Amino acid sequence: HMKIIIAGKNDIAVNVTRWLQKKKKNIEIYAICNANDTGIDTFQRSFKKYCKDNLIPIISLAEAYKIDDAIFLSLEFDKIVQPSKFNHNELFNIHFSYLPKYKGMYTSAWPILNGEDTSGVTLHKIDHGIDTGAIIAQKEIIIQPFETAKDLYEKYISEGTSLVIDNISTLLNSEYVEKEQNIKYSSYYSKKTIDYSNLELNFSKTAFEIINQLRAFTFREYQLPKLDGVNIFLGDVLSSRSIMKPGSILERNDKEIIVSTIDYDVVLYKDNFKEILEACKYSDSKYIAKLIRAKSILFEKNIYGWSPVIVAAYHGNIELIKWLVSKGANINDRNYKGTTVAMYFKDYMLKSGDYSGLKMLIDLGLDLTLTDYKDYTVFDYLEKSGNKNLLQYMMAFM
Amino acid sequence: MKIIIAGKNDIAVNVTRWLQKKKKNIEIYAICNANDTGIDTFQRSFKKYCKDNLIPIISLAEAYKIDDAIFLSLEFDKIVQPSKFNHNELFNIHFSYLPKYKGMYTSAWPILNGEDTSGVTLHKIDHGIDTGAIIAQKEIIIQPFETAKDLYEKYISEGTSLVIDNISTLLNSEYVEKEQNIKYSSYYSKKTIDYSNLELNFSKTAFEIINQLRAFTFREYQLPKLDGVNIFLGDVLSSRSIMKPGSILERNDKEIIVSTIDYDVVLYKDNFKEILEACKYSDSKYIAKLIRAKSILFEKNIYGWSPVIVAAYHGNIELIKWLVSKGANINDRNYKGTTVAMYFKDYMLKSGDYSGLKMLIDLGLDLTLTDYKDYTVFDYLEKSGNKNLLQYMMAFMK
Ligand SMILES: Cc1cn([C@H]2C[C@H](O)[C@@H](COP(=O)(O)OP(=O)(O)O[C@H]3O[C@H](C)[C@H](O)[C@H](N)[C@H]3O)O2)c(=O)[nH]c1=O
Ligand SMILES: Cc1cn([C@H]2C[C@H](O)[C@@H](COP(=O)(O)OP(=O)(O)O[C@H]3O[C@H](C)[C@H](O)[C@H](N)[C@H]3O)O2)c(=O)[nH]c1=O
Ligand SMILES: Cc1cn([C@H]2C[C@H](O)[C@@H](COP(=O)(O)OP(=O)(O)O[C@H]3O[C@H](C)[C@H](O)[C@H](N)[C@H]3O)O2)c(=O)[nH]c1=O
Ligand SMILES: Cc1cn([C@H]2C[C@H](O)[C@@H](COP(=O)(O)OP(=O)(O)O[C@H]3O[C@H](C)[C@H](O)[C@H](N)[C@H]3O)O2)c(=O)[nH]c1=O
Ligand SMILES: Nc1nc2c(c(=O)[nH]1)N[C@H](CNc1ccc(C(=O)N[C@@H](CCC(=O)O)C(=O)O)cc1)CN2
Ligand SMILES: Nc1nc2c(c(=O)[nH]1)N[C@H](CNc1ccc(C(=O)N[C@@H](CCC(=O)O)C(=O)O)cc1)CN2
Ligand code: NA
Ligand code: NA
Ligand code: NA
Numbered sequence: 198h199m200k201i202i203i204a205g206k207n208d209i210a211v212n213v214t215r216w217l218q219k220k221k222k223n224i225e226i227y228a229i230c231n232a233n234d235t236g237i238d239t240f241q242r243s244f245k246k247y248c249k250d251n252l253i254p255i256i257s258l259a260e261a262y263k264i265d266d267a268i269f270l271s272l273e274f275d276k277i278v279q280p281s282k283f284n285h286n287e288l289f290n291i292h293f294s295y296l297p298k299y300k301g302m303y304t305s306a307w308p309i310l311n312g313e314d315t316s317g318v319t320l321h322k323i324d325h326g327i328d329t330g331a332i333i334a335q336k337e338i339i340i341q342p343f344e345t346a347k348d349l350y351e352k353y354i355s356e357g358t359s360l361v362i363d364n365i366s367t368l369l370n371s372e373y374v375e376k377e378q379n380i381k382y383s384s385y386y387s388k389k390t391i392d393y394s395n396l397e398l399n400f401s402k403t404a405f406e407i408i409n410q411l412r413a414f415t416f417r418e419y420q421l422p423k424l425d426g427v428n429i430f431l432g433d434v435l436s437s438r439s440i441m442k443p444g445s446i447l448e449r450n451d452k453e454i455i456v457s458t459i460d461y462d463v464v465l466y467k468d469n470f471k472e473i474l475e476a477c478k479y480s481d482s483k484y485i486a487k488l489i490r491a492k493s494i495l496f497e498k499n500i501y502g503w504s505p506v507i508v509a510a511y512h513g514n515i516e517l518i519k520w521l522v523s524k525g526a527n528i529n530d531r532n533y534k535g536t537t538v539a540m541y542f543k544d545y546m547l548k549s550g551d552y553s554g555l556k557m558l559i560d561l562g563l564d565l566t567l568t569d570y571k572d573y574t575v576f577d578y579l580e581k582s583g584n585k586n587l588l589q590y591m592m593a594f595m
Numbered sequence: 596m597k598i599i600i601a602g603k604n605d606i607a608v609n610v611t612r613w614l615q616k617k618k619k620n621i622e623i624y625a626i627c628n629a630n631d632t633g634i635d636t637f638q639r640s641f642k643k644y645c646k647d648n649l650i651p652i653i654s655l656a657e658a659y660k661i662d663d664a665i666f667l668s669l670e671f672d673k674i675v676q677p678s679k680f681n682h683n684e685l686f687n688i689h690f691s692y693l694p695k696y697k698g699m700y701t702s703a704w705p706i707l708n709g710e711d712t713s714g715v716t717l718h719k720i721d722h723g724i725d726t727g728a729i730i731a732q733k734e735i736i737i738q739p740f741e742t743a744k745d746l747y748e749k750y751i752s753e754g755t756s757l758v759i760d761n762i763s764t765l766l767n768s769e770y771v772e773k774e775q776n777i778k779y780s781s782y783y784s785k786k787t788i789d790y791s792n793l794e795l796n797f798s799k800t801a802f803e804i805i806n807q808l809r810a811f812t813f814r815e816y817q818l819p820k821l822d823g824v825n826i827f828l829g830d831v832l833s834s835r836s837i838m839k840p841g842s843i844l845e846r847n848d849k850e851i852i853v854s855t856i857d858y859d860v861v862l863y864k865d866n867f868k869e870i871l872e873a874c875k876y877s878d879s880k881y882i883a884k885l886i887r888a889k890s891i892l893f894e895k896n897i898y899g900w901s902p903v904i905v906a907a908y909h910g911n912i913e914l915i916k917w918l919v920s921k922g923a924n925i926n927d928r929n930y931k932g933t934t935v936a937m938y939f940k941d942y943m944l945k946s947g948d949y950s951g952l953k954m955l956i957d958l959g960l961d962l963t964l965t966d967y968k969d970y971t972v973f974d975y976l977e978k979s980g981n982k983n984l985l986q987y988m989m990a991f992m993k
């Protein structure tokens with residue numbers, strides 16, 4: 198009967214909480230929610246919803262301050278805590294950097310902006326200061342040259358979650374070891390350091406720096422970078438070097454804009470994600486390939502969570518799914534309610550009366566055992582619509 | 596064969612010096628910077644050197660028309676247009692390890708950013724800013740306590756070598772060039788720092804703020820200020836105040852302690868004027884108690900007087916001994932080339948006390964050096980009629 202307060206948001210809060218509920222069923226869990234948590238699952242899960250849907254008490258921070266014999270774990274919590282208000286000193290935080298670097302804000306952007314090759318997540322003690330307390334455990338993260346800030350945020354969430362899981366016992370049982378943070382290389386960025394109201398690309402900068410600006414500001418659900426009004430989804434560095442002043446527009450067609458920089462010219466790729474989603478209903482890979490400038494655009498998602506592979510499956514675009522998956526697409530990709538490819542494919546099967554592509558999907562690793570966020574399999578769904586015939590067909594592949 | 600040297604400071608002067616020694620063949624032409632006052636300062640006036648050594652001063656427009664020359668920029672203040680030349684032998688010394696830190700304030704920015712290294716780079720000039728192909732380069736290690744001025748001087752010293760070690764190949768067309776890498780290329784325009792409006796930022800880590808101090812410590816432009824008080828470096832404390840970053844925890848006459856994001860910082864009031872005044876007559880024990888940042892012992896006033904210089908003029912042998920034990924240059928010079936030995940002779944002359952000289956010489960005093968009029972200490976004594984001091988000082992030469 199230990200107690201834990203989980204304060205925070207997003208898949209990290211939700212996933213730590215379920216690990217706790219799966220593996221530590223006699224703990225008392227209390228929750229604090231971020232101010233801007235809407236109760237609606239988005240590109241991240243709502244932690245507030247998860248808690249309402251799993252009878253987890255939501256409390257205030259003032260309540261939390263009073264609870265005794267509780268550990269306090271912050272997972273992307275929106276508040277600077279006052280440690281001395283607590284009874285105890287068992288206050289912890291995952292921070293999304295390799296501390297002591299990159300204390301504070303926008304750790305998905307700054308390391309990219311500054312040109313880093315790596316970052317990390319850090320488990321540490323909460324003291325009065327911002328991401329300043331003693332370090333318990335850390336993990337280095339490689340940032341790939343092609344990765345955006347959104348790509349990086351996902352690795353923080355994913356790696357942060359495992360870091361917590363792999364140490365939380367020691368937090369609960371006071372087995373853990375801490376070490377004050379170094380002086381050397383400590384760095385911090387406040388909220389003023391980037392104005393997300395007033396983004397503008399700075400072209401009086403190197404090709405490296407401009408691509409890094411792009412990468413760092415590519416996070417579609419907040420924004421994409423813009424050039425003369427029009428959204429951009431990555432780019433590349435050309436071998437030419439224009440005599441025109443940095444920022445000068447050398448060329449502009451339907452796919453791309455070419456620009457002078459301090460050094461090498463760059464091409465900026467027009468965001469054509471919407472066009473591509475639309476095209477993934479019926480078009481073959483030959484066609485989709487011609488639209489593809491940055492390869493990673495194939496794994497983007499609209500507001501519903503629809504990726505290309507998802508829209509493909511819904512329309513029964515089997516050969517397109519073969520190619521998407523060959524390019525890296527998740528065969529069991531999910532929307533923002535956890536609806537799998539298989540579930541989308543099921544509606545196709547049912548509308549069309551054609552079940553013959555299921556084998557070939559299965560052969561690509563499609564998993565029918567998966568549950569959406571209300572714990573329903575694709576089978577449960579066939580039961581509730583009364584399509585027992587298809588349910589029995591699909592069962593053959595288990 | 597002809598060479599156009601366009602630039603300023605001891606880099607331009609000493610390169611020119613070396614050429615007039617080792618390459619008596621060459622016709623030299625100079626271009627000077629707009630803020631070369633004609634008068635020696637902490638750096639030698641190149642304009643002055645060219646007037647005193649029969650080198651015609653010309654404009655950049657003139658330099659475009661000179662055939663059969665190479666063009667060598669050594670902190671030249673202008674963006675040149677390669678295409679207006681009759682040839683392509685266009686070279687520059689840039690004060691960074693290219694391709695990082697193109698552009699401006701390269702003695703500030705690597706420090707601000709926390710770099711342990713920088714360097715100098717010989718490269719071809721093309722239309723862009725520090726963008727052309729690399730011919731040679733040298734890493735410079737930035738010691739943890741070196742200021743921007745320390746870094747600047749090393750840039751001057753190391754770029755001087757790098758030119759001398761390579762200039763024949765530039766005059767003979769036997770040099771190799773390699774295009775600059777895309778990756779890590781970085782650049783800072785003049786707008787990136789407003790030197791008329793410098794403001795210490797304590798919403799930062801201790802590391803960052805010391806580095807701000809170091810970066811803006813370049814005395815003959817400016818020192819950083821806290822409440823109109825000039826500051827000469829500082830240190831990082833083990834305490835971590837709870838007060839908001841930038842709160843003054845302590846004030847006295849030697850120092851100011853401030854809260855940061857992480858560790859508290861000690862800021863040292865500038866007491867160089869005081870210290871220089873104490874150097875005339877006080878002993879090492881007094882002077883050591885006045886010192887906070889050790890490198891303040893090497894600072895110079897407007898005349899080019901350091902501590903060891905003031906000590907030598909006033910006959911303070913014990914203090915010289917110690918100054919040197921702490922790393923001071925036994926042969927330090929003012930801005931006219933006048934050496935320690937030349938100040939100490941003045942003292943020997945006026946006091947009649949000749950006693951300290953032997954020890955000084957064992958510590959390194961070099962009587963053979965010449966000022967910027969090509970006078971040794973002996974030439975002055977000879978003119979003076981001081982036969983006895985002439986003889987006596989000559990007895991100690993090694
Ligand atoms: C606000 C915002 C963020 N982003 C990117 C950069 C961020 O690193 C990433 C995540 O944004 P975010 O609002 O989740 O917050 P971050 O600023 O990453 O994390 C801070 O805020 C959290 C709530 C915690 O207090 C955390 N300990 C803080 O360091 O999204 C945008 O692209 N556009 C935006 O407008
Ligand atoms: C992918 C896709 C979906 N849709 C439809 C199907 C859904 O009924 C509706 C909402 O999409 P959504 O991703 O929010 O779906 P969800 O509500 O998450 O999933 C429901 O619909 C699926 C098709 C399965 O039947 C599942 N069993 C349902 O619970 O939009 C399209 O019209 N075009 C599309 O390209
Ligand atoms: C202007 C200025 C400079 N500084 C420091 C920072 C600089 O790195 C250092 C030297 O100043 P600086 O004006 O000589 O030039 P920097 O900005 O170093 O060098 C650029 O300007 C030169 C004239 C050349 O064109 C060179 N190619 C450029 O790199 O002094 C101050 O501390 N306060 C100041 O107000
Ligand atoms: C270092 C120092 C110098 N002085 C004086 C000595 C000079 O007469 C005057 C100008 O200083 P400076 O460094 O510009 O001297 P310079 O003009 O460089 O050198 C002359 O004066 C020296 C003392 C030697 O005789 C030398 N051989 C001369 O060429 O200031 C002081 O009063 N207090 C001092 O602490
Ligand atoms: N005590 C304390 N509280 C914490 C942590 C800590 O390690 N110490 N760790 C987590 C970090 N949480 C944050 C960090 C920063 C903000 C934030 O909002 N920062 C603004 C604050 C500006 C301001 O304070 O005015 C900024 O840095 O620009 C919000 C939650 C959770 N709470
Ligand atoms: N061609 C060209 N000319 C050169 C070099 C070069 O490699 N290419 N190498 C040297 C670098 N000299 C400089 C570099 C920048 C400035 C300067 O003043 N820059 C302002 C820009 C002024 C402007 O363009 O508006 C800035 O960078 O913010 C002055 C001399 C000298 N001449
Ligand atoms: Na902001
Ligand atoms: Na260009
Ligand atoms: Na400026």
Ligand code: NA
Nearest residue numbers: 836854855856
């Ligand atoms: Na503090």
